[PDB]
Each structure stands twice: as C-alpha cells, then as structure tokens.
Amino acid sequence: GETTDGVYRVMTRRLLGSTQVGVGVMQEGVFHTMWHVTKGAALRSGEGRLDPYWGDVKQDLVSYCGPWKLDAAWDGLSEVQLLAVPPGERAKNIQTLPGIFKTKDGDIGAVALDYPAGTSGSPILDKCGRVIGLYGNGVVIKNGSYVSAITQGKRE
Amino acid sequence: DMYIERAGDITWEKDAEVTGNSPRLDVALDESGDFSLVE
Numbered sequence: 333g334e335t336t337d338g339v340y341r342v343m344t345r346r347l348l349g350s351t352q353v354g355v356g357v358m359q360e361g362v363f364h365t366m367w368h369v370t371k372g373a374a375l376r377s378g379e380g381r382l383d384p385y386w387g388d389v390k391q392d393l394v395s396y397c398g399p400w401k402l403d404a405a406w407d408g409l410s411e412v413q414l415l416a417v418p419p420g421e422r423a424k425n426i427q428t429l430p431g432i433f434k435t436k437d438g439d440i441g442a443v444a445l446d447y448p449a450g451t452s453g454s455p456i457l458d459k460c461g462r463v464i465g466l467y468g469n470g471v472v473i474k475n476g477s478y479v480s481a482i483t484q485g486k487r488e
Numbered sequence: 489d490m491y492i493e494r495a496g497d498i499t500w501e502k503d504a505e506v507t508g509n510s511p512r513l514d515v516a517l518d519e520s521g522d523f524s525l526v527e
C-alpha cells in the first residue's frame with residue numbers, strides 16, 4: 333500500500349458506515365499509533381497488510397512494519413503544534429504551550445486541547461516539524477477539561 | 489478490519505491558530521496505561 337511519510341487516519345468498517353477510530357504517523361517505513369486505537373490488530377493499506385512489530389499497553393504505543401522510529405523530544409520551553417486529524421474533517425495545526433505531567437518517574441509535557449476520541453494518535457510537532465509524541469492518552473482535570481500527555485516512544 | 493488513509497504531510501504551520509493553557513499536574517500512570525490525578 334501507501335508508504336509515503338505523513339499523517340494517516342485509522343478507519344474501520346465494522347460499525348455503522350466508515351468510522352475513524354484514530355490517527356497515526358508513517359515515518360521511515362514504520363506506522364506509529366497509540367495502542368488503544370488498534371488494540372494491536374493488523375491494519376490494511378490499500379491491498380497491503382501492516383503487521384504489528386512492537387507495542388506496550390502501559391506506554392500506550394504500537395509500531396507496525398518495524399521498530400519505533402520517533403525520537404524527538406519537547407524542549408520544555410517552546411510552543412508546539414498538535415496536527416489534529418478529527419473524524420470527517422481536514423488535518424489542522426493548533427499551536428500551544430505545553431503544561432507538565434509530574435510523575436514519580438519524571439516529568440512529561442502535556443497539551444490542554446480537547447478533540448473527539450477518534451483523534452488519538454495525532455502527532456505533536458516541534459518548530460522543525462519533528463514528531464515529539466502522539467496525542468490521546470491523558471486525564472480529565474478539576475474543571476472538567478481534557479489534558480493529553482505528549483507520549484513518545486524509545487528508538488532502540 | 490482496520491485500514492489507513494493518508495490525511496497530510498507533517499509540517500509546522502506559520503501563523504496557525506494558537507490556544508490552550510499549560511497546566512502543571514501531579515499524575516499517576518497505572519499498569520493499564522491510564523493516567524490519574526494525584527490529590
């Protein structure tokens with residue numbers, strides 16, 4: 333199928349019509365998305381099949397056709413852009429200054445933007461267009477708003 | 489049967505819409521990959 337680098341929608345025809353369950357990134361021949369989008373199932377790209385290669389439920393990440401390739405990191409100072417790909421809508425860039433998730437194992441950037449569930453896997457980018465993580469695994473805070481971690485994998 | 493469809497290039501947009509706050513939150517991550525607020 334299509335192997336061109338870029339952002340892609342992840343779709344299913346199991347439910348009513350064609351439903352967008354999430355989003356992912358094609359980079360260096362590997363497809364990257366969040367585990368909760370595919371639950372580790374195989375994917376189709378035209379007539380071709382993409383098989384899972386690595387995944388981790390706790391990180392909530394999965395890669396297809398090869399190992400995780402994305403290794404850019406948020407600098408902790410600058411604004412980033414969410415390249416939101418909402419269901420049935422055009423890809424759109426949203427610029428924001430991340431907040432922080434403080435955990436017992438270290439701090440992670442977080443973006444306070446709220447999109448439909450089928451937007452999970454959309455990439456967060458730095459000013460050079462590098463993917464610093466994927467949007468869609470987060471929490472609901474005091475005022476009821478959604479905040480996503482900037483989730484990044486490890487390039488072995 | 490899940491399938492993928494290209495939606496665009498990955499590029500920074502000059503003068504994109506700018507929004508969202510920057511909260512600093514104490515959080516916990518469980519074995520199932522769920523984040524929760526520590527209070």
Ligand SMILES: CS(=O)(=O)NC1CCNCC1
Nearest residue numbers: 447448449450451452478
């Ligand atoms: C998990 S998501 O980011 O794809 N969308 C949800 C965000 C929280 N409100 C409900 C939708």
